[model samples]
Target: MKCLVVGHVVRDIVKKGNKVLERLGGGAYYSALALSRFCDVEILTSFSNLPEEWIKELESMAKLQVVPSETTTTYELTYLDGNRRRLKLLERASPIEELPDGEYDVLLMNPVAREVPPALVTSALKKFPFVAVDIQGFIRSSSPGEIQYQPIDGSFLKGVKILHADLGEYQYLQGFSPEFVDVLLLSNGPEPGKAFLHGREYTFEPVHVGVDESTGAGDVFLGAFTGFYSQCPFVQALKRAAAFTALFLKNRSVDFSMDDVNELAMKVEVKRV
Candidate 1:
């Protein structure tokens, strides 16, 4: 299956205690990278300062539709004890205004900034058989300080198949109606996560492991869930994706298989609420 992910590539400056790191990131990059392990993935984004190695790494996974932009979206992420973190927007990228001319099998809107517009999410529903989204970008503030979360009506997301959001972003989304969402995935670090399928609640435990960095863990969960859910059943997909994501969080690689996923998934607890 061919998947199209729309968003902006990012420059991440991460700090944990005395350690610091600079890396390529963003929902578009991380989601597309994780989904590529399941099927063909393409990224529609813009970045001027994208590293040559990162460029090559992404190029090998999928086609890049780069809309020329003045600067890439940049963030300074500071991780505190446990899963607490702070974000600072350093640079903002231009909005994604173009839609490539193709009918993709799946469409994943993984915007990290407001680069992907709300109208695009509405218009995207008609072009793909399955569509998923991460609401972080839609609710983010563009101001030049610590990132802010702005609440917006969820009306634009009507007909979306899946919606993934962390606890922070979900606090704003919680106020809005989610009748349009098919699967509402809520994740919070190593803590257990809950998914609302239709009106029923199903809570699942995350595979626990030491986290040196938790930057793209949520994005990986989004991609892996949507990827496995593309071919598996509801609860089965959740378990599989959780297993895949746990491996990635600990190893930072997608070298594992369904056999490995099933082994880990068997130990995971999924109880209906």
Candidate 2:
């Protein structure tokens, strides 16, 4: 199965313990890299023209289609605590005007900043049936190169097949339940992962492991979970997703290859609490 991911590509500057780590990141990069472990993935990203070396890095992972623009979105991240982080915007790109035309089995939309237009989603949904979206970026915005959490309207959230977010994002969607969300996976960062099925709740605590960096953990879960769900049931998909994410969390690395995911799937333990 093929998955088309639409979002922003960013140069992530992560600050930890007085040391700053720079890497290529964003929902587009994070989700596509994780999903590539399970299926063929393509990313539609808005980026500014950068050194060929930077672009080549992403090309090695999956098909990279850069949006026609001069400036790419860039992010500066600072971890307040282990799980809490603040983001600052360095630059923004223009909205994507044309999306690649084709039949994609799964359409994953994760807008990291202001590039996501409601009309763009509406247009894509008309062509793709199965769609999953991340609302974290929608609740966030950039001002004077600083990021802030803000609220948006429900109308921007129609026709989403699966909705993934953290506890804070879920609280914003107060009255909406699992049925309303189709499939909802709420990640509490490191606290256990939860899923909603037919209004029933299932929770799984991640295996304890040292983490190098907590960035892009939720994106990894959503991408891997969706890849499994495209071919499996929701519960099984959840198991696979939790397992894949657990390994990455324990390992504290973002470079999760296919072999690593398969190995983790076989060894992960899940049970009722």
Candidate 3:
């Protein structure tokens, strides 16, 4: 299956105590990389002056279509404690304006910032059979450099196949109903997540793992779930995604296979809530 991911790729400057790390990141980056492990993936984004290594690595993983811009999106993530981090936007890339014209099996719109327009989501609903969106970027409002809470109207969210978001972001989705979408995937960061599928509640537990950093785990979960759900049931996908995310957190690798995932999937707990 072919998946088209849209958003901005970010220059992630991570600060944990005295240790500082710079890595290529963003919602599109994490999701596309993980999805590439399952099927063909293409990313539509804009950035400039990225290092050769980051460019080479992303290109090797998936088809990269970069739009020219004066600056790349950049962020400073400071870990306050376990699974708690503060984000400051250093630079904002140009908003994504156009989408490639083609028939794709899945369209995953996981923007890191407000780089994607609400109208694009409406367009994607008509373009792809399976559409998954993240509310992270849509509900974000940045002033100067500090990011704040914001909203996107529900007209863009209605009729989507899958919607991924945290509880904080959900409040911004005015006029949105849980039953409107096929699935509403909610995250709680290292804790059990309660999701609404067809307006019925379901809860899934996260696998126990060491936290090196919690930067891209949510995006990874969304990507893995999308890949697995493309072939299986919701329960199966949830289990596999939980296992896949835990393994990625443990080792930060997607080189593992389905068999490896199955070994851990058996341990994940998914039940009706």
Candidate 4:
């Protein structure tokens, strides 16, 4: 299977109490890392003045199509409490004007700092056979060194095969169009999450693990779902994704083997909602 991940490469500044860590992040980075383990993955992203070492690290993982910009999209995340974060946009990269020419089995649209335009996402849905989106990008509004959530149009999600959103984003979009999506994956922190597929709702429980930082856990979950959904049933895919996400949250590393994923997958329980 071949996967195409579209989004921006971001420089993340995370602050928790007195400790601060700067690292490479964004949907393209995290999702590609997870997807690369399952299939041949490619990234379409924009960044400016990023270090060669960072670019090399990303390129080592997947085929990269880098768009030059004035600066890379940068974000500052301050942790207020468990699973609660305050985000500030420090810099923005140039928006993606076009997608790389390719035919992919699965396309994951993950944008950070509003770098992906809604039109681009709409166009991708028509081009790709299977398209999954993280709706957080479309609902974000940014200004000079600030970012906030805004209302999103349901029309943007039209024709998408798989949709991913946190509990808050899912609730906000529910007021727009709940049934337009084919499969809706809703994550609620460490709690059990729900999946809507074919007019049926299924609930899956996640493993309770101590989280170090949940910076890119959702993107990883989406990547794992995309990886498994091609071969397994919808509920099975959700269980596999939830298990992978639990391991990621606990290990905080992407170095786990497929055997580890399989073991964790056995612990996830799914039931009809």
Candidate 5:
């Protein structure tokens, strides 16, 4: 299957106590890496003067299209607690104006900032057969040193086939029309993940693992779920994604095999609620 991953490519500056790590990140990086293992993935993102090594790594995994910009989107993330971090926007890239033309089987939209306009999202829904979106970027607004959650129009869920969000994002969508959301994936840090689909609620527990930082776990989960769901049952995909994400948090390595994911998936417990 061919999958189109839409989002901004960001440079992440992570600070933990006295240590700092700078790396290529954002939804485009995380989602494309995870999705590439399952299918042919293509990235539509914006960046400027991105490191040569980063471009090479992304190119090795998927077909990449770069939107020219003066400065790439950058973020400074400082961890407050486990999986809870504070965000500061260092720079913003140009908003995406055009989407690639192709017959894609799955569309994974994961904007790290406000680079992806709402109009583009609506346009994608009409073009793709299956559309999965991560709502973190849509509800986020940043200032000098703080990032805040803004209100989103519920109508934005109209054509979304799969919706991914954190607990906070899910709470904000409580007033929205649930009928429009075909499948909802809710992640609660190290807690059990929940999936609401076809009026049924399913809960899947994550493996207990040491995680120093969880910057792109949500994006990984969405990518893994979409990748697996394309070939397996929804429930099976949820279990596999939850397991894969837990393992990823523990290892933080992209070299693991499908057998490893399958081995961990068997240990993951899922139940109807």
Candidate 6:
């Protein structure tokens, strides 16, 4: 009935041309916002001193429970190609030690930086039953003012039920086969044009549309997958996720209702490959 997401919530600083832009972003914010559409969802996210505007934005979006820290993690994104870029963590506080304890249908640990420690994963396994992860945040590298990433082993991947990773992150998890994950969702940045899950592979044609900006498209995919999987079958969940993400990527924005998802899902054509 309810889903809980625990991770970083931060101010995202994105660089495009001569302009510097900030948006409300983080794994918890994007994933939880999208998840709230389909489930009674709440976010257990970390922050430094919560600003009034960020607080107001979160409050308006969904029920948010805060975990305190001296500073919240912040990221800077520099786009190179349309679907490729570099990221830097401008600042980060001490990783969270205490996470909320509760029983929920699903628990999503989606750390944007190192904010969600490995200890949190161990603790969540003891506290919650089904845990899913967007492991991109755990493998982040911080340069002078930015965060770049290489993949890591999901060996700490105990007690997680579902795991989603883009191609780069998946390479870091080399030792773990698909069998190691209950449902493994892999993304390769719209190339290869497919996703593999539950030992079955599904391929889709990339959406052809004008690009706006691709900030949190992966978050959108993970959000839709986590939210829809809570109620739909595995194949349906995968299709719905793929469709939702394609639309977001093509539009270069995140704005959709259930009707939007339904309409898109109907048009999605998946093939066994």
Query: Per-residue lDDT of 1-273 in model 1, one digit per residue for the tens?
Result: 899999988999989999998888899988987899889999999888777998898899889998888888899999885478898999988899878769888899988888888888877876566789999888997777798888888877778889998888888763455556899898888999988887578999998888867888888889999998888899989998899889887777777776888799878888998
Write the residue-wise lDDT of candidate 5 on 156-258 in tens digits: 6776888888897776563575557788888898898789886478898888887678888999999998888878888889988988887777777567888
Q: Which residue ranges in model 1 land beyond 4 Å of their true spot?
A: none
> What ranges in model 2 sit over 4 Å off?
250-273
Over the stretch 1-273, how does candidate 2's per-residue lDDT look in tens digits?
888898898888899768897787888778887788777888888877765776886787778777777877888888866678877898887676577888888888887886777677788878888888887777776554677777666564566777789987766654355666567788787777778765467786655555546777888889888888877777667777877877766665546565666656655554432
The residue-level lDDT of candidate 3 at 149 comes to 80
Model 4 misplacement above 4 A: none
* Tens digits of per-residue lDDT for model 3, 1-273: 899999999999999988999999999999998799789999989898899999998899889888789989999999876578889999988898888889889999999778888888888888777889888988887444768887667776788888888766788888877887888888888898877889899999898887757788888989998888888888989889889888887777787877999889999999996
Q: Estimate the TM-score of every prediction.
A: 0.96, 0.88, 0.96, 0.95, 0.96, 0.88
lDDT of 6 by residue, 38-92 (tens): 7778888777765688788777766787765777777888776666777777777
Decreasing lDDT order of the candidates: 3, 1, 5, 4, 2, 6
Candidate with more favorable, higher TM-score: 3 or 5: 3
In order, candidate lDDTs are: 0.86, 0.75, 0.86, 0.82, 0.83, 0.73
The alpha-carbon lDDT assigned to residue 41 of candidate 2 equals 85
- Stronger candidate by lDDT (4 vs 6): 4
* Worst ten in a row by lDDT for model 5: 170-179
Error of 2 at 261 (Å): 3.6
